[PDB]
Ligand binder design. Sequence first.
Ligand SMILES: [Mg+2]
Ligand SMILES: [Mg+2]
Ligand SMILES: [Mg+2]
Ligand SMILES: [Mg+2]
Ligand SMILES: [Mg+2]
Ligand SMILES: [Mg+2]
Ligand SMILES: [Mg+2]
Ligand SMILES: [Mg+2]
Ligand SMILES: [Mg+2]
Ligand SMILES: [Mg+2]
Ligand SMILES: [Mg+2]
Ligand SMILES: [Mg+2]
Ligand SMILES: [Mg+2]
Ligand SMILES: [Mg+2]
Ligand SMILES: [Mg+2]
Ligand SMILES: [Mg+2]
Ligand SMILES: [Mg+2]
Ligand SMILES: [Mg+2]
Ligand SMILES: [Mg+2]
Ligand SMILES: [Mg+2]
Ligand SMILES: [Mg+2]
Ligand SMILES: [Mg+2]
Ligand SMILES: [Mg+2]
Ligand SMILES: [Mg+2]
Ligand SMILES: [Mg+2]
Ligand SMILES: [Mg+2]
Ligand SMILES: [Mg+2]
Ligand SMILES: [Mg+2]
Ligand SMILES: [Mg+2]
Ligand SMILES: [Mg+2]
Ligand SMILES: [Mg+2]
Ligand SMILES: [Mg+2]
Ligand SMILES: [Mg+2]
Ligand SMILES: [Mg+2]
Lengths: 155, 117
Amino acid sequence: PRKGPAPKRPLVNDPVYGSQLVTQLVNKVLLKGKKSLAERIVYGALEQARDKTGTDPVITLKRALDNVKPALEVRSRRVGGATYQVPVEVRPDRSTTLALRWLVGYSRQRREKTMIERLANEILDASNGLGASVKRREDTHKMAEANRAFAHYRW
Amino acid sequence: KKNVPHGAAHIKSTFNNTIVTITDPQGNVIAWASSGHVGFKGSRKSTPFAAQLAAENAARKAQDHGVRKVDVFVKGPGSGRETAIRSLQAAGLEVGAISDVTPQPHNGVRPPKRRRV
RNA sequence: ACUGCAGGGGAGACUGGAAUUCCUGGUGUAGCGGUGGAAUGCGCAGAUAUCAGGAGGAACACCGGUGGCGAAGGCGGGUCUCUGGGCAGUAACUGACGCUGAGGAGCGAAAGCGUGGGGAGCGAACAGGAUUAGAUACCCUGGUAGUCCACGCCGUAAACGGUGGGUACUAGGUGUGGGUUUCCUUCCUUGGGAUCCGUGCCGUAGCUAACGCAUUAAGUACCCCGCCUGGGGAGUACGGCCGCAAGGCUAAAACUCAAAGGAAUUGACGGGGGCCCGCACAAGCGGCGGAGCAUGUGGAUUAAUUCGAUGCAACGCGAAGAA
Ligand SMILES: [Mg+2]
Ligand SMILES: [Mg+2]
Ligand SMILES: [Mg+2]
Ligand SMILES: [Mg+2]
Ligand SMILES: [Mg+2]
Ligand SMILES: [Mg+2]
Ligand SMILES: [Mg+2]
Ligand SMILES: [Mg+2]
Ligand SMILES: [Mg+2]
Ligand SMILES: [Mg+2]
Ligand SMILES: [Mg+2]
Ligand SMILES: [Mg+2]
Ligand SMILES: [Mg+2]
Ligand SMILES: [Mg+2]
Ligand SMILES: [Mg+2]
Ligand SMILES: [Mg+2]
Ligand SMILES: [Mg+2]
Ligand SMILES: [Mg+2]
Ligand SMILES: [Mg+2]
Ligand SMILES: [Mg+2]
Ligand SMILES: [Mg+2]
Ligand SMILES: [Mg+2]
Ligand SMILES: [Mg+2]
Ligand SMILES: [Mg+2]
Ligand SMILES: [Mg+2]
Ligand SMILES: [Mg+2]
Ligand SMILES: [Mg+2]
Ligand SMILES: [Mg+2]
Ligand SMILES: [Mg+2]
Ligand SMILES: [Mg+2]
Ligand SMILES: [Mg+2]
Ligand SMILES: [Mg+2]
Ligand SMILES: [Mg+2]
Ligand SMILES: [Mg+2]
């Protein structure tokens, strides 16, 4: 807003998987306050991820996010009679936020039957660099690397 | 198939475009790759980014004719004027001296009328 | 008149360099150009670029300014020839010969006109592209008259300091252009003091409706000239004079309105400026707009659909209870 930056909220570690990255994942899956339901989806998907790799699934999940973190996004501006995008460097806390929105966001429209197995398959494909959430990592980068000429419009 | 060890690079930087040609000391063109040759069309040609890709496409095509050191003659009131001298350096050319040969008339010919934009 | 001095003041002839454009040729090859964004256009039959040579016209970077000159319009590349005016000093000379000037006469930016040259760049008209509801415009790409020269005509500008010319007087402060002259004076400082002539800014008395002017008066006085008498109709008509024409100069009335104006004050407004806020946008999550139903409303229907609410700030509102 006008008067400076706003405070951000702290997250407590998940009791099963000792990671801040998992409790930030269950908040993206959360709808309508159903947080015990959103925890059974995320726990049921990460335990379906060690039934196919054997490795502890927060190691899979940190590899799945490092393939869907963007580094250059495409914020817009109107200059004169024409409007065109300006590439900007993404600060590191937005990168985890925008990546976890893409995993949960594209797993709601995969073709399996339940949300547990849709979220499980999206983590395994993103860990290998395969799924649709990885495709928006480079569609963000292609649109940012086709507008290098507009990088002097840093506001 | 030519081989000239020392050259001269001319950079004309206008408000719409930049053109980087590279000659011998007698004034005979080796390569000339400009900002429209590198793929751009419209108002994008006048940005500083299209100048530092025009200067690379003329530098690493002058080296196929053996040019290892150029002199720099810049002229024009353009944006891409320092980003085309710094772009010849990071492509394998020694720059030496930099001169400004902007054609400055002694109040001769009459300019066009001013724009009511 | 003599002696010094400053200057784009004027006219004529010869002449200098940068750049714009075209031409001949070399190197080179696929784009150049243009805009808020684009297209028309140029180019692939060798453009743009880049180096060399040549043709031609116009304008004169730096010096250059807050500065100089001229009655005003205006005037700057260089040199030469002819030529106008001003300032200071000396006090040699004439002895009021002075000021203004009705009509008159000359000069008078730019556009335009006539005959004849010239034509690079710019560019009314015009043509195409764009924008747009349309775009006879702004913007883009071309482009004729014209801009230039010789000789004539025209005689108008916000021709402005919106302030006619001469003279005398009425505190100063501070820059600057042109002279002359005493002191520590040759310790150079070209500093300071005095004095005459310009050119600016700031300011007291004084004036003004106010803004403002103020020794360069719009102050205090005298002499001559042009002009004004409410706004429109109108610097138009008719008549005349001038012009090759465009048109210029002189110049009304009927009729119509009760105003038209000047300076300043408070606001509001601005596709004006400065700083600052708001779920205002941005960054996010969930909706409305499509479906079916409940409810209020517009319209229509009806014997009656009781009345009220109507942009935000009316429409699950007055109704927290219509068989
Ligand atoms: Mg002279
Ligand atoms: Mg003459
Ligand atoms: Mg020349
Ligand atoms: Mg020509
Ligand atoms: Mg040629
Ligand atoms: Mg050429
Ligand atoms: Mg001369
Ligand atoms: Mg006597
Ligand atoms: Mg007289
Ligand atoms: Mg008279
Ligand atoms: Mg005359
Ligand atoms: Mg004329
Ligand atoms: Mg005519
Ligand atoms: Mg003529
Ligand atoms: Mg003629
Ligand atoms: Mg035009
Ligand atoms: Mg047209
Ligand atoms: Mg008049
Ligand atoms: Mg004038
Ligand atoms: Mg007058
Ligand atoms: Mg007087
Ligand atoms: Mg004075
Ligand atoms: Mg004053
Ligand atoms: Mg008065
Ligand atoms: Mg009257
Ligand atoms: Mg008349
Ligand atoms: Mg008549
Ligand atoms: Mg007023
Ligand atoms: Mg006011
Ligand atoms: Mg305002
Ligand atoms: Mg929003
Ligand atoms: Mg609905
Ligand atoms: Mg009603
Ligand atoms: Mg309500």
